[PDB]
Amino acid sequence: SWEVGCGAPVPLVKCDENSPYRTITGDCNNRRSPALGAANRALARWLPAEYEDGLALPFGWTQRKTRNGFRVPLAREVSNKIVGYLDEEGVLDQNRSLLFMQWGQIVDHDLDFAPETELGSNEHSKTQCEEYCIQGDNCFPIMFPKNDPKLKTQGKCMPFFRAGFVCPTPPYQSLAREQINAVTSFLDASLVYGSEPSLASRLRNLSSPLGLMAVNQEAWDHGLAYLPFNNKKPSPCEFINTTARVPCFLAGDSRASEQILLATAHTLLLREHNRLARELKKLNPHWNGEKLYQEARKILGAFIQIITFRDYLPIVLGSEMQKWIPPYQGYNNSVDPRISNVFTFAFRFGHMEVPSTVSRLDENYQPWGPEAELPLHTLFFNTWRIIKDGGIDPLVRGLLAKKSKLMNQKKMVTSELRNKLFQPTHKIHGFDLAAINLQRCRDHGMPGYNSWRGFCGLSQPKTLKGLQTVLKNKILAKKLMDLYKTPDNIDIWIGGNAEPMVERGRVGPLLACLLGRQFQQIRDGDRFWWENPGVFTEKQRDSLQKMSFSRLICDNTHITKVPLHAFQANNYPHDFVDCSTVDKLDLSPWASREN
Ligand code: HEM
Ligand SMILES: *[C@@H]1O[C@H](CO)[C@@H](O[C@@H]2O[C@H](CO)[C@@H](O)[C@H](O)[C@H]2NC(C)=O)[C@H](O)[C@H]1NC(C)=O
Ligand SMILES: *[C@@H]1O[C@H](CO)[C@@H](O)[C@H](O)[C@H]1NC(C)=O
Ligand SMILES: *[C@@H]1O[C@H](CO)[C@@H](O)[C@H](O)[C@H]1NC(C)=O
Ligand SMILES: *[C@@H]1O[C@H](CO)[C@@H](O)[C@H](O)[C@H]1NC(C)=O
Ligand SMILES: [Br-]
Ligand SMILES: [Ca+2]
Numbered sequence: 221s222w223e224v225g226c227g228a229p230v231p232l233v234k235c236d237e238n239s240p241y242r243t244i245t246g247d248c249n250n251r252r253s254p255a256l257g258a259a260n261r262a263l264a265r266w267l268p269a270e271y272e273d274g275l276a277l278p279f280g281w282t283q284r285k286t287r288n289g290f291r292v293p294l295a296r297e298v299s300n301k302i303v304g305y306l307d308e309e310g311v312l313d314q315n316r317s318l319l320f321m322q323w324g325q326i327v328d329h330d331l332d333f334a335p336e337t338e339l340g341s342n343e344h345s346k347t348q349c350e351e352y353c354i355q356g357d358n359c360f361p362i363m364f365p366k367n368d369p370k371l372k373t374q375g376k377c378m379p380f381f382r383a384g385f386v387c388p389t390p391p392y393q394s395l396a397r398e399q400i401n402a403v404t405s406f407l408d409a410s411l412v413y414g415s416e417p418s419l420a421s422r423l424r425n426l427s428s429p430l431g432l433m434a435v436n437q438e439a440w441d442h443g444l445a446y447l448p449f450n451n452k453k454p455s456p457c458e459f460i461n462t463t464a465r466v467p468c469f470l471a472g473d474s475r476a477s478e479q480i481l482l483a484t485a486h487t488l489l490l491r492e493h494n495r496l497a498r499e500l501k502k503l504n505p506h507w508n509g510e511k512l513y514q515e516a517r518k519i520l521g522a523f524i525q526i527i528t529f530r531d532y533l534p535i536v537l538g539s540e541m542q543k544w545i546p547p548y549q550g551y552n553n554s555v556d557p558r559i560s561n562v563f564t565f566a567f568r569f570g571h572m573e574v575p576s577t578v579s580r581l582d583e584n585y586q587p588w589g590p591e592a593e594l595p596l597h598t599l600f601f602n603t604w605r606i607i608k609d610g611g612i613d614p615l616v617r618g619l620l621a622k623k624s625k626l627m628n629q630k631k632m633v634t635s636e637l638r639n640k641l642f643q644p645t646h647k648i649h650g651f652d653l654a655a656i657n658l659q660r661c662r663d664h665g666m667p668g669y670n671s672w673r674g675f676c677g678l679s680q681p682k683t684l685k686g687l688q689t690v691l692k693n694k695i696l697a698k699k700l701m702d703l704y705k706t707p708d709n710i711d712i713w714i715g716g717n718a719e720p721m722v723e724r725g726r727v728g729p730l731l732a733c734l735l736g737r738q739f740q741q742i743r744d745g746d747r748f749w750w751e752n753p754g755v756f757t758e759k760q761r762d763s764l765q766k767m768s769f770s771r772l773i774c775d776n777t778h779i780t781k782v783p784l785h786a787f788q789a790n791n792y793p794h795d796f797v798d799c800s801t802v803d804k805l806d807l808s809p810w811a812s813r814e815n
Contacts, residue, residue, distance in 0.1 A: 223395050228388045229260040241514040242521070242748050244413060244420040246404035249747050250553055257405040257557040257745070259415035262386040262398035263334065264558040267675060269396040269665030276397040278360060278382075278662035287668075290705040295658035296378070297365040298714060302699050303654040304638055305631040308576045313626035313789070316573075316726070319769065320535070320787045321624040322481050324570040326489075327528055329411045329473050329482075331742070332564045333402045334664070336381040337389045341645070346381070350646065353377040357390055360663065362655050370639075374650050379643075382663050398561075399664050403473065405559045406746050407528060409521045411473040412489050423448075423472060424513065431497040431512025433490055434470075441611035442778060445491055447471055447483075456601045456644035466604035480599040480606060481578060484615045487606075491776035493520055496807075503811045515810065522750035523767050525743075531769065531787055533739060537732055538725025544736025548743060551752040557745030559738065561664055562672070565713045566734040568657055569727050572717060575625040576634045580614035583780070585621050585792040588614040597640035597649050613777050620773070620782060621792050627726060629696050629718060654714075661711040669715030670708045676733035681707045692720050759809035766803045774799035 235248040246258040272279050280292045339358045340346050349359035353376045361377035364370050383399045385392055404410040414420035425432035436446035447469035457468035457477055468477035476486045496516035534541045576596055580588035633654045641651035670680040681687040687697040687707050704710050719728025748755050769786040773779055781798050783790035
C-alpha cells in the first residue's frame with residue numbers, strides 16, 4: 221500500500237558494488253538503498269506537502285479558496301511591496317566578495333534542479349500561457365496586481381509553468397505531487413560532468429583517448445579552453461544578440477549560460493578537469509581513457525567539497541556552523557543524503573546577494589575599457605560578451621575585487637532580477653525572480669513559515685506584535701501582515717529571508733537550520749565524501765587540504781595575483797599576493813607504479 225517507491229525515470233543500471241568512482245547518476249552510493257541521492261528522483265519531503273486540494277493544486281490556484289481563512293497574496297504584489305527597492309547606493313557587502321555569491325550558485329546547481337514540465341513546446345499551449353495568460357494544467361501565470369507598471373508595458377501576467385513531478389506528466393492524483401530533482405543530491409561536481417550517462421558522454425572528448433572534456437572548437441581564450449557550444453537552435457544566447465550570434469555553452473548542468481559569471485565559473489572548473497587529465501597522464505602514462513577521466517573527476521569533486529565545507533559554509537552559517545555541521549565523524553550509511561524540497565527554496569537566499577552590476581577589470585584591477593561595468597540584466601544568457609569582449613580573466617578579476625550585495629530587509633532583491641529577468645522561450649527582459657520564487661514555493665506545496673519555524677524548534681508568531689519581534693522590524697512585519705494576514709501563510713522563501721542575520725552569518729536562524737541540516741546530511745550520507753577512509757589515500761588527503769579557490773584561478777586563467785581568502789572582501793593591491801605564493805595542488809600522491 222501507499223506510495224512505496226514510485227518513479228518513471230529510473231533505468232538500466234547495475235551497481236558494481238566495489239567500484240572506486242561515483243556513478244554519474246548517483247545510484248549506488250548507498251549500498252542498501254542504491255537509488256538514494258540519485259538524479260531524477262523526487263526531492264525529499266521533510267514535511268508533508270501542502271496543496272490547496274491535498275494532492276497537487278497550489279495555494280493561489282482557485283480564487284475563492286483561502287489558506288487558513290485568507291486569500292494568498294499575488295506573488296508579484298508581495299514582490300512589489302516587500303522585495304523591491306530603487307537605490308543601489310550602500311547595498312554592498314563590506315566583507316563578502318562577489319565570488320561568495322557566485323559560489324553559492326555553483327553549489328546550488330551541484331545539488332538541485334527541479335525543471336519545468338514541457339506540456340506543449342512543439343504546441344502553442346506554451347505561448348497560450350504566454351500570450352493569453354490562461355491558467356490550466358501546467359500553466360500557472362503570475363498575474364500583475366492593479367497598479368503594476370508592467371500592466372502598461374507587458375500584458376496581464378508573467379507566464380509560469382509548474383515544475384515536473386515523479387512518475388512524470390501531466391496526470392497525477394492518488395498521492396501527493398512530488399517534484400523531481402534532476403541532478404545528483406551528492407556534492408560531486410555533477411554540474412561539471414552531468415547527472416545522466418548520455419550527457420556525461422557527450423561532454424567528453426571521445427576522439428583522443430585521454431580522459432578529457434570536449435572543448436570549444438570554434439573559439440579559444442588566448443589559447444585557454446571555452447566550454448563547447450550547445451547547437452540547440454533556438455539558443456536564447458543567440459537571441460540576446462543576433463548580430464554576434466554566439467550560442468550558449470554546453471556543460472553538465474543545463475543552466476550554465478543563465479548568467480555570465482555562472483558561465484565563467486563553469487569554464488574555470490572544466491579547465492581544471494582537462495588540466496588534471498593532462499598532468500595525471502604525464503605522471504602515469506600507463507593510465508587509459510576512463511582512468512584519467514575518473515581520477516580527475518574524483519579530484520574536482522573533492523575540491524568542490526572542501527571549498528564548500530571549509531571556506532563557504534562557515535561564512536554563511538556564522539555562529540550556527542557548529543550547531544548543525546559538527547566535525548566530520550565518518551560515513552553513516554543511515555543518513556538520508558537526498559535534497560529536500562524546502563532546501564531548494566532555502567538556498568535561494570542567494571537571490572538577495574546578487575548586486576546590480578558586474579565589472580571587467582584589467583591586469584591592474586582597473587576598469588577594463590569603456591563599458592567596464594555592465595548592468596546585470598544585460599548578462600543573462602550572454603556568452604557573446606565572454607567571447608567577443610575579453611575572455612574570462614577580466615570577469616574573474618571582478619569576481620575577486622568586487623563585492624556581493626548584502627541582504628537588507630529594506631532592499632531585498634535588485635531590480636535587475638525583480639523586473640528585468642530574461643527567461644528562455646520568452647522575448648523580454650521583463651520577468652521577476654522574486655515573484656517567480658513565491659509562485660514556485662506554492663507550486664511545490666511548501667508548508668508556510670510557521671510550520672518551518674516549528675520544524676526548527678523556533679517560536680511561531682501569530683500576531684503583528686509577534687512578527688515584529690521575530691523580524692525585528694515593525695514596518696516589514698506590518699507589510700507582511702497586510703498581505704498575508706497570518707504569519708502562518710507567509711511563503712517560506714520570503715519568510716526565511718526576512719529574518720535578521722545570525723552573528724557572523726549571512727542568513728537568519730530558520731535558514732541556518734534548514735541549510736545546516738541539509739549540508740550535514742550531504743556530508744554524512746556520502747560514501748565518497750572526500751575524507752571518508754579509503755576514498756583517497758592519506759597522502760592524497762593531505763594534498764587535497766592545500767586547495768584554494770585562489771589556486772583554481774592561478775591555473776586556469778592568465779591572472780598573476782589574487783587574495784589569500786577569496787570569499788571575504790578584498791582590496792587591490794593591499795590584499796593581493798602573487799600566484800606564486802598560492803599553494804599548488806601536490807599531484808605526486810596519485811602516481812601509481814602499477815602495470
Ligand atoms: C545572477 C544570478 C542568479 C540568477 C540570474 C538566478 C536565476 C535563477 C532562476 C531563473 C531560477 C529558476 C527559478 C524558478 O523557476 O523557480 C533560480 C533558481 C535557483 N536559484 Fe538562482 N539565480 C542566481 C543566483 C543564485 C544564487 C547566488 C544562488 C545561491 C547562492 C541561487 C540558488 C538558486 C536555487 C537553489 C535555485 C533552485 C534550483 C532548483 O532546485 O531547481 N541562485 N535562480
Ligand atoms: C580532443 O582532444 C584533442 C587534443 O588532444 C583535439 O584534437 C586536436 O584538435 C585540432 C584540430 O581541430 C588540432 O590541434 C589537432 O589536429 C588535434 N590534436 C591532436 C593531439 O591530435 C580534439 O579537438 C579534442 N576534441 C574536443 C572536442 O575537445
Ligand atoms: C571578514 O569575515 C571573516 C569571516 O569570514 C572574518 O574572519 C574577518 O574578521 C572579517 N573581517 C573584517 C575586517 O570584518
Ligand atoms: C552585439 O555584438 C556585437 C559584435 O560583438 C557588438 O559590436 C554589439 O555591441 C552587440 N549589440 C548588442 C545590441 O548587444
Ligand atoms: C547517523 O549515524 C549515527 C552513528 O552511526 C547513528 O547513531 C544515527 O542513528 C544515524 N542517524 C542520524 C543521521 O542521526
Ligand atoms: Br538558474
Ligand atoms: Ca550533485
